[PDB]
Amino acid sequence: NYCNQMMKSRNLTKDRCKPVNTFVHESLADVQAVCSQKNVACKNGQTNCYQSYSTMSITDCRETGSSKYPNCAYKTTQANKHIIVACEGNPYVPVHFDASV
């Protein structure tokens, strides 16, 4: 299961089980480029969020109901959607994943 292995490999579920996580299958530079695309408000109202002009390939990882540490279990769902990221710093790069429409 891609989700169980990647979450483990990336030090996400090595010391706990994280409910949900999203992996973007695009190039680093192509994702960083989103910080200068469509500006939109973040869920918290903040306006340093940006939406991708086009959809991107993603894999949504969600914990099943039988998941319990130390044996986390995820459900894998692939799809293509716009990603919304919050940007900060210089260079203006993504620091938070806000959502995917």
């Binding site: 030090n11 999203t22 973007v24 680093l28 993504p94 994943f97």
Partner: peptide
Amino acid sequence: KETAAAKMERQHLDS
């Protein structure tokens, strides 16, 4: 240790 920009890539990027 790890920056917010680095954390983001490690947690969500799989190019």
